[PDB]
Amino acid sequence: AANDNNVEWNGLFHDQGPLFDNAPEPTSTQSVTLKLRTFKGDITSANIKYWDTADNAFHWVPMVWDSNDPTGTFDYWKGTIPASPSIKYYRFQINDGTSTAWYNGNGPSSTEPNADDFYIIPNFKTPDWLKNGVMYQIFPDRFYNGDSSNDVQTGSYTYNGTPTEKKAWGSSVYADPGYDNSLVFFGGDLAGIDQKLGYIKKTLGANILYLNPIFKAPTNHKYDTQDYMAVDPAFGDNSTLQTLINDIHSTANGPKGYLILDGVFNHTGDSHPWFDKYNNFSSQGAYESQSSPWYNYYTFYTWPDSYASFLGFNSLPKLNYGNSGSAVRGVIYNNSNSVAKTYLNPPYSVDGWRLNAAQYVDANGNNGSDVTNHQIWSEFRNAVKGVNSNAAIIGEYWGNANPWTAQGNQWDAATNFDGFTQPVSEWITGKDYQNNSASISTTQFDSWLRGTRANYPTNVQQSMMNFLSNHDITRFATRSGGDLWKTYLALIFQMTYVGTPTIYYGDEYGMQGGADPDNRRSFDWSQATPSNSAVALTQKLITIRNQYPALRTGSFMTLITDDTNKIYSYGRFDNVNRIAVVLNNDSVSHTVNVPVWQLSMPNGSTVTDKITGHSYTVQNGMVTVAVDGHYGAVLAQ
């Protein structure tokens, strides 16, 4: 490069990784020094332009040359944004004589962007254990039956007139004639999860557990809460939970663990005493009397049969949050004995909450996604972080969750359906997560990923829950048509991408399953071993991620987007390691020239493909590697 009235886009780069930002999560008194990469001697000047919410105006910070990279190929320009409590957004203006280019969260541009600027949110922090960990999601009744004495039996009880049905482990989840799909129980419990912590924390290596609802409720999914204060008898008792938590946090069965519970706060079940639609309690619930002490906890359009609920489901009456200080906000998060604080405080001390249907939480029966909804989650954060600043808050949202994360006053992250699950599914399986035909090319995949990462602050990105499948969508192995190699490819991407890799129980061995409830099959333990190829790969990838901080918090740079051969390559790097991932989404092998020079991997240096174990030497800035179809390479040094 040179001063030739032309800014070379390929040499430009910046994100909030270690090499380019010295304060990714600054407090009110910490200044932020940023570095912009360009090819060596390519430009004449660069400036940081940032919007300050403190005064609703743009501010200018001229950059100065700082240094070259070890290969002498690039220059690093530096600039510092002053310290203050205000949220700020920034982009770069890069000049080389008569040539000008812009750069922000969405990469380089000729015209000045008006969206996707990088974020600076003083005092906003997301749990570092969440950024660096691997999550394992468990649907309680379907994981492991550690205590058959608490098993729900066929006819143990009835809900809305229908008796419960017990089914042999491994059998179909579909209820037999006369029974209901939501009242089918296999026996999985908390004791079981406890006895299997070794498999989770050692055989696989995950250190974070996320459980679906475990509080008293008549159904098998239990999102129709009957009593937030009690673990459901089928799963054990509150004492069992205390022990499970202690064993999760313990290091006697593997690395220190963390527990995240599912918080169903938008609604209760219709059998909850506050509502009591079937009169299961002597007390008078809202449905029973307009004089009920909990009458105002819900919203009736025409008492008592027409009331606000989740998506119109009468079994899930929607909670009325009212105004700040209300009784509902009280029992949900403000009170010391609220659902949120009770489990965050000892004797429980869980590590976080996954907020079910978080977008709908509101007052007066409204549908959320409004000022009140955001105000509520703001108060929720103050409540949670006040008890444990290291407790995670992950909201359920299938789209762009920027509104609940970008101001640093609500969630730490969200279920990454839009920035991970969907794009990964359409690129690799040619199906959306509902198993409908929907395919995207490699260039679309890369653009989709970048655009969605840009929706969030960096710490949020690193904390997103990235799962291949979950209890609300079809199994990845089913969308892939049973081709285990597609699962291999997906796992390699998952474990090397930005965000918390999240494994939906069973996905590690290729469990299949269609739409709810077939996506909640009981776990086949004969597959919970390295003998199973997908399990062996999962364990290896988790070891790799744990071995390289660059994969968890390092920078992300696109390297190759080949639509003809379906080759996708990107690099993850920091001050210590440089890793170039090469994914082959084609059905045939391809020999790829990986441009590792972009990550500043020195010519003559060696790299090791952590997948095959083969080593290569960097030559002419490249690493030539033959990658098998529906497989990948993780070239690290």
Ligand X SMILES: OC[C@H]1O[C@H](O[C@H]2[C@H](O)[C@@H](O)[C@@H](O[C@H]3[C@H](O)[C@@H](O)[C@@H](OC[C@H]4O[C@H](O[C@H]5[C@H](O)[C@@H](O)[C@H](O)O[C@@H]5CO)[C@H](O)[C@@H](O)[C@@H]4O)O[C@@H]3CO)O[C@@H]2CO)[C@H](O)[C@@H](O)[C@@H]1O
Ligand Y SMILES: OC[C@H]1O[C@H](O[C@H]2[C@H](O)[C@@H](O)[C@@H](O[C@H]3[C@H](O)[C@@H](O)[C@H](O)O[C@@H]3CO)O[C@@H]2CO)[C@H](O)[C@@H](O)[C@@H]1O
**Interacting residues toward ligand Y by CB under 6 A:** 3, 40-41, 43-44, 65, 68, 75
Q: How far is the CB of 334 from ligand X (least distance, A)?
A: 22
Q: From the list 226, 315, 373, 519, which residue makes contact with ligand X (rule: CB under 6 A)?
A: 315
Judged by beta carbon distances under 5 to 8 A according to partner kind, the member of ligand X, Ca ion, ligand Y, none in contact with residue 44 is ligand Y
240 binds ligand X (CB under 6 A): no
- Minimum CB distance to ligand X smaller for 276 or for 586: 276
96 binds Ca ion (CB under 5 A): yes
Going through 30-164 in order, the beta strands assigned E by DSSP cover 32-39, 45-52, 57-62, 64-68, 74-81, 88-96, 99-104, 107-109, 118-120, 135-138, 158-159, 162-163
Q: How far is the CB of 97 from ligand Y (least distance, A)?
A: 9
- Minimum CB distance to ligand X smaller for 396 or for 412: 396
Binding range to Ca ion, per CB under 5 A, among 179-187, 312-320, 446-454, 545-553: 179-187
Q: How many Cβ atoms are within 10 Å of 559's Cβ, its own excluded?
A: 20
518 binds ligand X (CB under 6 A): no
Q: How far is the CB of 63 from ligand Y (least distance, A)?
A: 9
187 binds Ca ion (CB under 5 A): yes
223 binds ligand X (CB under 6 A): yes
- Minimum CB distance to ligand X smaller for 316 or for 596: 316
Tokens 């079910």: give the residue.
356
Binding range to ligand X, per CB under 6 A, among 70-78, 312-320, 436-444, 542-550: 312-320
For residue 350, what are the contacts with CB-CB under 8 A and spacing of at least 6?
245, 259, 260, 261, 343, 344, 391
CA distance 127 to 132: 9
- Minimum CB distance to ligand X smaller for 356 or for 421: 356
Instruction: Tell me how far CA of residue 181 lies from CA of 178, 220, 268, 356, 506, in angstroms.
Output: 10, 8, 20, 21, 20
User: Which pairs from 24-28 meet CB under 8 Å and 24+ separation?
Assistant: 24/458, 24/459, 25/124, 25/125, 25/126, 25/459, 26/83, 26/120, 26/122, 26/123, 27/122, 27/123, 28/83, 28/84, 28/85, 28/122, 28/123
Running DSSP on this structure, what letter comes out for residue 106?
A: T
Q: Which of 11, 51, 17 is nearest to 34 (CA)?
A: 17
356 binds ligand X (CB under 6 A): yes
10 binds Ca ion (CB under 5 A): no
**DSSP percent split of the chain into helix, strand, coil, nearest 5:** 25, 25, 50
Q: From the list 15, 21, 42, 426, which residue makes contact with Ca ion (rule: CB under 5 A)?
A: 42
Instruction: Tell me how far CA of residue 209 lies from CA of 348, 535, 541, in angstroms.
Output: 15, 17, 18
Q: From the list 279, 382, 575, 617, which residue makes contact with Ca ion (rule: CB under 5 A)?
A: 279
415 binds ligand X (CB under 6 A): no
Sign of the dihedral defined by the CA atoms of residues 330, 331, 337, 338, in that order? negative
Q: From the list 15, 194, 232, 396, which residue makes contact with ligand X (rule: CB under 6 A)?
A: 396
Between 93 and 132, how does the x/- string for binding to ligand X read (CB under 6 A)? ----------------------------------------
69 binds Ca ion (CB under 5 A): no
Q: How far is the CB of 62 from Ca ion (least distance, A)?
A: 18
Q: From the list 128, 472, 562, 628, which residue makes contact with ligand X (rule: CB under 6 A)?
A: 472
For residue 356, what are the contacts with CB-CB under 8 A and spacing of at least 6?
223, 262, 263, 264, 265, 266, 396
Judged by beta carbon distances under 5 to 8 A according to partner kind, the member of ligand X, ligand Y, Ca ion, none in contact with residue 68 is ligand Y
CA distance 166 to 153: 5
Q: Residue 335 burial (CB < 10 Å; 0-12/13-18/19+)?
A: middle
141 binds Ca ion (CB under 5 A): no
Tokens 């938590």: give the residue.
245
Judged by beta carbon distances under 5 to 8 A according to partner kind, the member of ligand Y, ligand X, Ca ion, none in contact with residue 264 is ligand X
Report residue 377 as tokens. Answer: 């989650």
Q: How far is the CB of 359 from ligand X (least distance, A)?
A: 9
Report residue 386 as tokens. Answer: 């006040």
Judged by beta carbon distances under 5 to 8 A according to partner kind, the member of ligand Y, ligand X, Ca ion, none in contact with residue 279 is Ca ion
What is the number of alpha carbons within 13 Å of residue 530 lying toward its C-beta?
Answer: 7
182 binds ligand X (CB under 6 A): yes
- Minimum CB distance to ligand Y smaller for 11 or for 501: 11
- Minimum CB distance to ligand Y smaller for 100 or for 558: 100
Judged by beta carbon distances under 5 to 8 A according to partner kind, the member of ligand Y, Ca ion, ligand X, none in contact with residue 593 is none
- Minimum CB distance to Ca ion smaller for 189 or for 232: 189
- Note whether 276 and 268 are within 8 A (CB): no
CA distance 303 to 407: 39
- Minimum CB distance to Ca ion smaller for 87 or for 94: 94
CA distance 376 to 321: 8
- Note whether 245 and 292 are within 8 A (CB): no
- Minimum CB distance to ligand Y smaller for 65 or for 525: 65
Beta bridge partners of 580: 571, 635
- Note whether 554 and 577 are within 8 A (CB): yes
Q: How far is the CB of 161 from ligand X (least distance, A)?
A: 12
Residues making contact with Ca ion (CB under 5 A): 4, 6, 42, 96, 145, 147, 150-151, 187, 189, 276, 279, 281
Residues making contact with ligand X (CB under 6 A): 180-182, 219, 221, 223-224, 264, 310, 313, 315-316, 356-357, 396, 471-472, 516
